[PDB]
Amino acid sequence: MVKEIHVEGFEAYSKAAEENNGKNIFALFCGSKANGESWCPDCVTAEPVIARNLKYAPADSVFIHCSVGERAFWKDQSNVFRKDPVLKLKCVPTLLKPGTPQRLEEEQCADDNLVQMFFQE
């Protein structure tokens, strides 16, 4: 297993990221959950692909699962995730290694080989 952190919203994400700033951080940005209905279909498709490829990450990695909030919050073009100078999120799902060019979006987050490449190097 790889360490995983589950956060809801930008403040909770920021705390997790700042407390792991010394580590190999991978982050998935996805829509919030009717508990057991995500509003983001491509998020739901990505989760299991990401889950089965996390083993390819280097041993002491940290996986942050970040729920961005409700669809209406996410649709706000000026929301904190879209305007963050490092995250610069354009959509959910996004898989990213913060502060690097390593990014996958939408259907690419369910692409088994690209997700393996993302975690492995």
Next chain:
Amino acid sequence: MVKEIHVEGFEAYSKAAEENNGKNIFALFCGSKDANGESWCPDCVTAEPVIARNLKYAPADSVFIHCSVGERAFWKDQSNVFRKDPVLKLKCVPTLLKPGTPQRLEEEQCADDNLVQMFFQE
């Protein structure tokens, strides 16, 4: 210097990419320029010199493909061949990408001197 190819449109990109498939390819996708070198894509204008002075960080034997996607009116079409390509999946210009990898920069990140260095660096 690093080998550079300058291509205009999808079929010309496709030829360069397929003839260099055995090589370490970096690609920049930008708006086409006018007859005075004038560009409709302001973020593309900004990115060009940052990318130019960081290419030296790419490995030896890299190939840099400078791809003009065409006019604004071509690019504005949400169904254009660059956006629908299953590998490129372009969402905006400028895009800096290693095709078939997670290595991608978009818009103002293409003019970020440290992210562009990191993108080329190996």
Next chain:
Amino acid sequence: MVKEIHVEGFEAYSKAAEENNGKNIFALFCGSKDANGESWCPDCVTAEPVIARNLKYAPADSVFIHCSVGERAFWKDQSNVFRKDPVLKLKCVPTLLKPGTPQRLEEEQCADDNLVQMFFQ
């Protein structure tokens, strides 16, 4: 002008249709737009102006429901509520239909000026 309702998703369409059940209902089913006003459905983009300039041919008290079915990822789901509804039985976007009738146009026929006129007139 003809009365127009703009709805997003199945629940909002269902409200509009049930509150207009005593009226002459025309419905367009289209891919959802981005903040950018931009569409993932190119046949939907081509149809809206054709439909906009032919709506004047509808009987004066008609009700035109513009229904955004959701994102591509929602629509691609072959079992989604729009495709499975017993009355709508949507097979594609765009679809122009008078619910519970044989009157239906799909894909490029929604940008056919004479067939769109015929649909409303």
Next chain:
Amino acid sequence: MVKEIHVEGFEAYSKAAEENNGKNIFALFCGSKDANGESWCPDCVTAEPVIARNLKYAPADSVFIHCSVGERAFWKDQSNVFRKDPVLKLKCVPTLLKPGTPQRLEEEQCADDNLVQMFFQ
């Protein structure tokens, strides 16, 4: 209907213009359409239907000249006959112009329904 002339290239355009010099001429300059295919000019393709549906606003005597300037490579030549012509002074395609007047629309303005109606009226 309004009289229309379809010409390919400068010499053909010059013959149509000179043979109609007594008349109210409107001219559209667009890219050539390659064999079995559309043009290389997307803004030309967008303009054509807007222009076609507003031509009825033109006055009595009117003549509409549809002029293909040639291939993209010819057009991109900054010294080509259309760009250098002392009356046409073309800067881009599409261009809608009443030769020898200040009446001119370019690029996206050629698909602006109200500016095109105004140009013909």
